[PDB]
């Protein structure tokens, strides 16, 4: 007996290659984006804009202390570089 | 070097000490007045793509 699919089924099915190619390309792009996001931080870090004020303060405390508080606490008169290429302030005026 | 009185006078800001207002060049507004990225420009440019720049919170 003939086990062919329905005529509408075949007519719609004459797109499967292009559909699969589009799906593969989209999956590749998405995986590349996910790998780029994950490899630097070993995870997918949540946006600070999606975190409350308390959460934002808790998240950046260590970074702020390491990048600003430490140099300010152990500053030396000769520590500042002779050029203007120093670290900019936390708030740009 | 200008004198004890001069140093005391130049180190006083408010006659009434009830109010507390630490000196700040500007007040934050972005991210509900928060610093989203506390790092250098090149530091952020590297951290967004190159690993190791994020010390994590744990």
UniProtKB/TrEMBL annotation, chain A:
The entry's keywords: Membrane, Transmembrane, Transmembrane helix
Domain of life the protein comes from: Eukaryota
Transmembrane segments: 19-38
Keyword Transmembrane assigned: yes
Protein name: Transmembrane protein, putative
From TrEMBL, chain B:
Protein name (Swiss-Prot/TrEMBL): Uncharacterized protein
């Amino acid at each position: 007996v003939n086990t062919a699919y329905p005529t509408p089924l075949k007519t719609i099915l004459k797109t499967t290659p292009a559909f699969v190619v589009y799906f593969v390309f989209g999956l590749g792009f998405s995986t590349v984006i996910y790998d780029v996001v994950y490899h630097p931080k070993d995870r997918i870090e949540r946006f600070y804009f999606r975190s409350s004020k308390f959460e934002r303060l808790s998240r950046k405390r260590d970074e702020k202390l390491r990048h600003y508080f430490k140099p300010a606490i152990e500053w030396q008169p000769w520590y500042n570089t002779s050029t203007n290429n120093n670290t900019r302030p936390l708030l740009r005026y | 070097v200008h004198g004890e009185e001069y140093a005391q006078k130049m180190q006083k800001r408010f006659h009434q000490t009830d109010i507390w207002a630490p000196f700040r060049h500007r007040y934050a507004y972005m991210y509900n007045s928060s610093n989203k990225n506390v790092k250098d420009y090149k530091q952020v440019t590297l951290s967004r793509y190159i690993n190791g720049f994020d010390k994590f919170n744990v």
